[PDB]
């Protein structure tokens, strides 16, 4: 509610194409369209899209909080983008970024997976991977793709983890 | 059988069966259901006049 | 892809050079000829219909004679049809040879098995046998109990009992091909194909790996 009422500045270099219930922001980082809940009435005025509730609708401002909240990414990530960081500690697992293909060998066959279009991976060091992208929902999903292979085992900490995540190591069963 | 016959022939003219009998009772007409059903089968011209009178007398 | 129609002849062995016998069977094939081609724009499936053999003038009826004479081919013992494999095209009147089976190396053989008549339960479903002594009377090979008491009251569908055994269509998979003789028109395949001598066998490439 308090996040709903605050006007978020939408800068230039963008388009506001209200094609009905669907919104096109064809611009610097592509489009994102979706039948918007028939409750959130949207209206273009000035560097912002005003959301209110339409009558007879149960959620109303509850859905308007979503329309300002998850589509705040629609405002910000088009011109700024987002960047994620991953690391791994412990030696014995190799995942390599061959173009849009990720290959991996872990003492198992090597397994493959794929990278979408608007994501670019860089390895400034042999252990640290930096991912650049366009959408929060896509970079989070490719993070869930990359982390699930060698998830951090909590005794000696070995595996693939985040840069800022904390993982608590513990003892190894004295008697 | 007769009730279903009168109900179909009355719903053909824009009034349900209950309002039809209510209007006929208020308008002081004592034709029972057999003669009503036979008239509704054979000649529609008298039946629509009866329905119109019931509609006028109801409201 | 498309197979062949042949006739089982017998069973023989083949000696390899290192001294290992290989039990094979021999299928004689005459050159099958394409009589009809179907397609998607008129029926709804792509398949060719072929014939083989030779038949007499009297035993062939008039409409079959006209239907063969449209394609211009001679008569045949029987008609079969194979589903086309989505990207092959063959004309009407072309003879399908035996050279086609020089690369597949894994075939399955389809045919009609033997028939053993009204065989009993022990031969058919592999039941077991009660004791032959220690008081056993008038019961050595009967099936036995066939269900419950005053609860289901009915024998369930699909109960295993006596009946006709054999004479059924069947298919044996993953048979190795061994020797293809395109001059005398023979096919020697390792294994045991179904059916008595003189039947009709259908040889197809194996649909599995």
């Amino acid at each position: 509610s308090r996040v709903a009422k605050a006007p978020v500045v939408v800068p230039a270099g963008v388009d506001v194409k209200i094609n009905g219930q669907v919104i096109t922001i064809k611009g610097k980082n592509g489009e994102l369209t979706r039948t918007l809940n028939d409750a959130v009435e949207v209206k273009h005025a000035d560097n912002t899209l005003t959301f209110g509730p339409r009558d007879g609708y149960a959620d109303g401002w509850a859905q308007a909080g979503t329309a300002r909240a998850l589509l705040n990414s629609m405002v910000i990530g088009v011109t700024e983008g987002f960047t994620k960081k991953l690391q791994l500690v412990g030696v014995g697992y190799r995942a390599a970024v061959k173009g849009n293909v990720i290959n991996l060998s872990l003492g198992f066959h090597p397994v493959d997976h794929q990278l979408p279009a608007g994501i670019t991976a860089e390895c400034p060091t042999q252990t640290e991977i930096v991912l650049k992208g366009a959408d929060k929902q896509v970079i989070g999903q490719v993070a869930a793709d990359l982390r699930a292979y060698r998830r951090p085992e909590p005794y000696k900490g070995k595996g693939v983890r985040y840069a800022d995540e904390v993982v608590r190591t513990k003892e190894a069963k004295k008697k | 059988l007769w009730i279903a016959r009168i109900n179909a022939a009355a719903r053909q003219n824009g009034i349900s069966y209950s309002k039809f009998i209510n209007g006929l009772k208020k308008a002081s007409v004592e034709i029972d259901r057999k003669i009503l059903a036979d008239i509704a089968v054979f000649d529609k011209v008298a039946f629509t006049a009866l329905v119109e009178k019931a509609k006028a007398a109801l409201a | 892809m498309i197979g062949l129609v042949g006739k089982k002849v017998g069973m023989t062995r083949i000696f390899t050079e290192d001294g290992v016998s290989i039990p094979v069977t021999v299928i004689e094939v005459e050159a099958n000829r394409v009589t009809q081609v179907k397609d998607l724009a008129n029926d709804g499936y792509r398949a060719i219909q072929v014939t083989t053999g030779a038949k007499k003038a009297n035993r062939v009826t008039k409409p079959e004679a006209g239907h063969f004479a449209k394609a211009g081919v001679e008569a045949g013992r029987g008609l079969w049809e194979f589903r086309l494999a989505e990207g092959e095209e063959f004309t009407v009147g072309q003879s399908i040879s035996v050279e086609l089976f020089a690369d597949v190396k894994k075939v399955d053989v389809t045919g009609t098995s033997k028939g053993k008549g009204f065989a009993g339960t022990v031969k058919r479903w592999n039941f077991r046998t009660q004791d032959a002594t220690h008081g056993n009377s008038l019961s050595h090979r009967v099936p036995g109990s066939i269900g419950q008491n005053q609860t289901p009251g009915k024998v369930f569908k699909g109960k295993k009992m006596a009946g006709q055994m054999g004479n059924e269509r069947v298919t044996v998979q993953s048979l190795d091909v061994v020797r293809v003789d395109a001059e005398r028109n023979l096919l020697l395949v390792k294994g045991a194909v179904p059916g008595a001598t003189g039947s009709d066998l259908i040889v197809k490439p194996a649909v599995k790996a």
């Binding site: - | 059988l1 007769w2 279903a4 016959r5 179909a8 022939a9 719903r11 053909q12 057999k34 059903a37 036979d38 509704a40 089968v41 054979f42 529609k44 | 369930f156 569908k157 699909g158």
Partner: protein, 142 residues
């Protein structure tokens, strides 16, 4: 004198087309089963069929309310030893939409020879193009 009974030879039958995009199931099948039996004519007789032929278009576009999209299960028994089969609504409407309509109208009609004689009239189609254009059907709004 006597109450007249509608003879089978002299009866007359029409053709209708029902669009079914965005309709609910029950309040469409009720009118279909009402018109098929012949209760909307003044010639009604309970032992003689007097209904009307009905064609239904866009059967795959029918809609249902609430969580009946997934919860509603359709069962049948194969009659064999220990088998029984179930299917949800989504899998059935993806496989065939004719059975969804034809299983709902069937229960609303009487049981017996007249039930099958009445059910023989209704003819549903999955798409939007019917092949009965020679009988000149009239579009009816239900």
């Amino acid at each position: 004198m006597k109450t007249f009974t509608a003879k089978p030879e002299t009866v007359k039958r029409d053709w209708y087309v029902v669009d079914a995009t965005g309709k609910t199931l029950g309040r469409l099948a009720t009118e279909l089963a009402r018109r098929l039996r012949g209760k909307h004519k003044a010639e009604y007789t309970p032992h003689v069929d007097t209904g009307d032929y009905i064609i239904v278009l866009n059967a795959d576009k029918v809609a249902v309310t609430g969580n009946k999209r997934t919860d509603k299960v359709y069962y049948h028994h194969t009659g064999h030893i220990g088998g029984i089969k179930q299917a949800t609504f989504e899998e059935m409407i993806a496989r065939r939409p004719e059975r969804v309509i034809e299983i709902a109208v069937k229960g609303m009609l009487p049981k017996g020879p007249l039930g099958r004689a009445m059910f023989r009239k209704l003819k549903v189609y999955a798409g939007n193009e019917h092949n009965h254009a020679a009988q000149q059907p009239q579009v009816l709004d239900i």
